[PDB]
Amino acid sequence: QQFLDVQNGQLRLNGEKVFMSGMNIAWQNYGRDFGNGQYDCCTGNALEDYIVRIKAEGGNSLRIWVHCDGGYTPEFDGNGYVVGTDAQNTMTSDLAQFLDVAYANNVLVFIVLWNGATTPTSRYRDLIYDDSKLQTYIDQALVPMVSALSGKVALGGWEVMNEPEGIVSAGVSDGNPCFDTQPLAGSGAGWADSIPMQRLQSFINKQTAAIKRADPKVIVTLGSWSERAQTDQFGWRNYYTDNCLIDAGGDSLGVIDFYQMHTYAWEGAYTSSSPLLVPNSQYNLDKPNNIGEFSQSGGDGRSITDQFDWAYTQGYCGAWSWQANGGGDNADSFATQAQGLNHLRGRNDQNAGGRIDIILQ
């Protein structure tokens, strides 16, 4: 049995280079889609409809978020130790149902545990700071879930945290360059909290390692809010290299498989080092790279088709637009995002992004 993997700096499925073309969902009911019987009562039909509608437009993948700010899941006891994925222990079965639908539609699913783009709830923040509590998350929620889901063919990968740089203390010197955030000074990082980089990296490293012990074939990614935290080129730094994650968390297995840069324009202009403006090779990375979020509305005027085209032709392993539910600042409509999916449908230039029309059988 074949699952999505990485070789020779390429994303591959079975023999073949593949490109992940799709949308961030990123949720239906934010932080309340999976777990606590929500999928069967309330969210499952809407969520499955996104899978179908994405595939119908020619996409082959999606990114979806689960715990978010920790406000609903996972399930914390009175002292902040985690006792399970959710109060009703439905999360795993809920995701199972979602993944079975994805398989039936030949769509690969990328699952994001935590959100770094909003301020954490105190129980979630405490997992970042207290390893004893984090280990209960790992043992009581994450490992059992990951293990149980380890045979689902449509599970493309896990992602510990969306945009850790939202909650990082930016512009702070350190003797260890892995923990030094001076390259992020003036970037707008740290809009939601000021947690040290080392603690974010450790949190990531430990959970990544735990996912890979529970499922030794699954890939893991980590979506940074801009290129500024995932390249050592252009004056930036790559905070999620094997060496930095291991330096922070101590676990040799806690390494990611593909880099993922999000990109949006600020005051109507992208950075000159935006992944929608430079070819992925200029980042000189040791893993493939996915443009994991972007949008036409959150761009500089270029069209959604221009953006998917750039990702496909200039060295990236995927492109996920923001976002299928159409909601909030910098979200495009589903219809707009569909135009980009349409544009990549049927492509299979192995010298460029590779196969779009994937078949999971």
Residues contacting residue 162 through CB under 8 Å, at least 6 positions apart: 26, 65, 112, 114, 115, 116, 117, 223
Q: Which domain holds residue 68?
A: 1-361
Q: What is the three-class DSSP state of 283?
A: helix
**What is the rounded distance in angstroms from the CA atom of residue 237 to the CA atom of residue 3?**
30
End-to-end CA distance of the chain: 9
Residues contacting residue 241 through CB under 8 Å, at least 6 positions apart: 178, 286
Q: Which amino acid makes up residue 140?
A: Q
Cα dihedral across residues 97, 83, 127, 241: positive or negative: negative
Residue 90's Cβ-side half-sphere holds a number of Cα atoms within 13 Å equal to 18
The resolution in angstroms reads 1.7
Catalytic residue annotation: 163, 293
Both tokens assigned to 77: 């006891």
Both tokens assigned to 64: 């979806």
How many domains, in total, are found in the chain? 1
Experimental technique used to determine this entry: X-ray
CATH code of the domain covering residue 5: 3.20.20.80
Q: Which amino acid makes up residue 242?
A: D
**What is the rounded distance in angstroms from the CA atom of residue 105 to the CA atom of residue 46?**
15
Element (H, E) at 97: helix 91-104
